[PDB]
Amino acid sequence: EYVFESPKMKEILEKIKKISCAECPVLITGESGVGKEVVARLIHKLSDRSKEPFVALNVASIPRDIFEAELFGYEKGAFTGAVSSKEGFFELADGGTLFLDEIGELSLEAQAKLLRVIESGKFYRLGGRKEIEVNVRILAATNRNIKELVKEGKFREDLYYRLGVIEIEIPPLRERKEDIIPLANHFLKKFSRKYAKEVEGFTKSAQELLLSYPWYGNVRELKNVIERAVLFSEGKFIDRGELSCLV
Amino acid sequence: KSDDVNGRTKMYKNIVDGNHQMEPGMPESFNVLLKEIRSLGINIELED
Amino acid sequence: GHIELASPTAHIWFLKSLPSRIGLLLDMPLRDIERVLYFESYVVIEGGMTNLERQQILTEEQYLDALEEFGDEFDAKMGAEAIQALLKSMDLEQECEQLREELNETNSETKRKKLTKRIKLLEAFVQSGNKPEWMILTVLPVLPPDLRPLVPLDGGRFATSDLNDLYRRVINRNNRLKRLLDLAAPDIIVRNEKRMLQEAVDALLDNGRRGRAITGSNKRPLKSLADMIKGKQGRFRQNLLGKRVDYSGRSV
Amino acid sequence: YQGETTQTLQDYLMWQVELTPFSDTDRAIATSIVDAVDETGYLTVPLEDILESIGDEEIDIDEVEAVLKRIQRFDPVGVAAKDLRDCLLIQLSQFDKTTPWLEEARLIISDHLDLLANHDFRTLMRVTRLKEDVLKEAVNLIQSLDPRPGQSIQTGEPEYVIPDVLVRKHNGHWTVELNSDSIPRLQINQHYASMCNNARNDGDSQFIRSNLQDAKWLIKSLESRNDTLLRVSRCIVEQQQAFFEQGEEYMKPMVLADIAQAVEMHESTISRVTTQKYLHSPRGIFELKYFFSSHVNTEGGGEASSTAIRALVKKLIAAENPAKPLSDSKLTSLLSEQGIMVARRTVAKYRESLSIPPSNQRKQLV
Amino acid sequence: KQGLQLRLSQQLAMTPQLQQAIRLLQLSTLELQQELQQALESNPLLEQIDTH
Amino acid sequence: GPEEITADIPNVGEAALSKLDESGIVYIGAEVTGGDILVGKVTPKGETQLTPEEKLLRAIFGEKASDVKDSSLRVPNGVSGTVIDVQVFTRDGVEKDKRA
DNA sequence: AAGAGTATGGGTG
DNA sequence: CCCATACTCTT
DNA sequence: CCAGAAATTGGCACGAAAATTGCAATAAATACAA
DNA sequence: TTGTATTTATTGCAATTTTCGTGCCAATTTCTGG
């Protein structure tokens, strides 16, 4: 279902296969639309935690004042309105994988709240006096440059070394030129099957056009372009005229 | 004369038509017995 | 139809019809097998590294002290699961050859008869396609409805039939046992529920053969499938060897 | 136990089909046709459906027509008719030509049957070019025919309902009680509940305590439900007491608020309790919600239940002159002489609810 | 203002006390019997008077 | 609805109702054979839906025919005799007919 | 350690 | 009443 | 006999009243520990 | 002597929908004088 034809992507696949026995947290970095989610789910699938939960969490959608309650849970009577005990996402993802998406959007006052949990795995619930120990593997994804954010001062240096034991960098689509045509054919077949059209390839000029456009949205932009071309097709082959949005 | 359901009808039709000949079949009580024995967990079946 | 039993149940025909096929196959007294099946005593399935044989009967206190002494070195069970495990773990060929050697060497009269009986049973099992553990029921067949119809009476009352009553009792016991096993109830209740399910299945198959018989409102025992099959009022003697016919009359 | 086989209309029809010199194709067509016959004796599908169900394209519609014509002469005569006109014409075709009014009846059935359905007797008489006497004889001959020939072989038994409340008259007083043959009840397993002791494991103790408390709560809930139902039924019977002595036309109008105030509850509880509950009385079996009705004002400051007015309308219609039926203006006047102040439109609505045709469709030649 | 916070406060809270055991009134005898059968299945300590 | 004992059965002829009185019960002293009607009774079969064909049937042949069906008591086949006694039992609270 | 005798349970009518 | 099997006394 | 006139019927409307359904967890009496 | 944890005792309020009676009027049926 996934296309890995560029040599860099095959090297990344070899790296993923070599760390299938590890439990250290992983840090995935790149541009937008390069496939960080794909790589994260592939890392989860090939490891020993294949059947274990995969909790994907967007850390930017958690309100500031209830961050601790969401992450760690609370006990009964902790505050006004706490009518029953409730667990957090670290207990929910216990024994499995926790995937923190867009870790670079977290604020400096919220990054300090998960410094001991990532390394030790032990924490206290809100209002609880017993220490809870969990076994969670942490994958983190970011589209920023953390190694530069820490130098600037907008990212805590204490969290980068806790998260970045293993670092993966996914190159942009404009450098994986051996993947543009296979991905185009894959998306074309998928969307032709979905919309019941009768297009079954590209012309010798459309392929040349697809290899020169500097894809800035990467694979997501390529997918959108292919879907739009399939929706408005008129024959059996896609010509350069249809792909006029490129250039 | 007793429990061949299709045989009864065929025999009656033949008698009305003036053709005194029967086409015997399987009695229904034997099928009931087979079902009852199967309901006891025993595999009993007709062969060939 | 079929019913998925929550726990395995033994077939009363292969336990109570003398000689007992289960007992003759496992070489055990009928009393001990009955104690194990109806949750009265334990039985060792795997002896382990201790001084416990593969078919020793353990009481409640004996099993408790065995657990307190040895721990997880062995395995003991009660009910139809233990009997099924014993039946599934036996090898027919090794038993056949060992007993043939013992018969060839030893000379006696009663023991020779016992060995001949066991050899005949084992060779009959091997020659046929059957398996011993098939004598423990896991799925229960259900008769077609038109062979067990409901009785319509004046006033709209439908009453009930013995077969339908037995099926309803079995279904109720099975559903309660499933619910109790799902909620992880204490063992003291689930053992009683399993015993009652075994009794209900026995009543459905052959009512009255094992101990007491379940009766109706007028203190009459309910008719089971065996009652439908056998006897002077059964299928063979009432419907197959003789029957009522058309084109007949009678007079003085 | 076992019952006995019964012969239905379709069994008799197939028995006659078996002993009829059909071909294999004709026999299959006859089987489909008999399958498409209801218990009143009428064909329920068009012949196109039968032709499609046969399953081959070598057969035309006229063969189906011939087989249907052959079948329609089975016993009873008129079975498997397409519509009422077809059944009447088939029944008439079996009569001898010496019948006095056969020709006029045949003409009326073949051509003018909707006019007879509208009870015209004016346009029908004009078109048929005939006098009243011969027209009346033809109508009487038509009405002697069988409209439902398939009911000769009748099968089935009526369905019943078990009452929840019994109302009787003991020592001259109307008494109300619950039906002991259907009152739900539960119990507590003493054998299981006798092991609720701290000697055993604490998990067993908490399990058994929770289950015992839930069981006791459920038993209390059932007991309260039964008591509430009995109280509501007793209040309802006490309020509507002239009905149980003199039947309808003596119903009093009442709503849920009256019973709610009488028993000191909320009308929501009264509404929920009386839902799908039945009461057995010497007059019959009635749903508990049958005793609540609207009302129309009565001269003198009183009120009249709509049930009583409907019963009065039915009784007044049932005892009229067949030649000159009562309209709604006449029924309104015959009700005003008794003090009932009801409108013409309401009387029309009441008559429609009783499934009674208007006045112009009830008149008779006689 | 409008916000979501965890805090310790002193408040006067309202009192809901109904919907308990109210659905049994509108059930007919047959549906009530089915509910009782389900409750018997789910509760070990509940039994029904038997005729056998 | 309740079953009604009546002399007005819509699906039987006038000759077959000749031995019944005004209450639908046979006279004392009548000679009867197999198939004759002793007590005339009808069973409700009404429905709240009226199809156009049902409306046509009710308009042409009357509403009584479409509401009830015959459930009368008939002499069993192979039985004959003379009516010598008739008894009527009525539940307390139900109105009595002429015969009672 | 086997072998003959007695008590118990199943089946039939 | 008659037969098969488990338990008990004896050579 | 005919055509105008009068009577009948039921569909739609409108305001009001009655019936139905969603809500889901508390309050008080009682027995026991300092 | 009291303060607190436990066990019975709680079967209504408030929207929302549905049903009620009765008027307006067009289409339809029936009646009557020249």
Ligand SMILES: Nc1ncnc2c1ncn2[C@@H]1O[C@H](COP(=O)(O)OP(=O)(O)OP(=O)(O)O)[C@@H](O)[C@H]1O
């Ligand atoms: N090798 C590939 N084969 C097929 N589809 C791919 C591949 N790489 C990426 N895609 C597609 O590209 C799209 C965008 O990928 P993805 O969601 O991983 O990007 P992202 O912006 O890095 O992720 P996120 O922001 O969700 O963490 C998806 O629809 C995915 O299916």
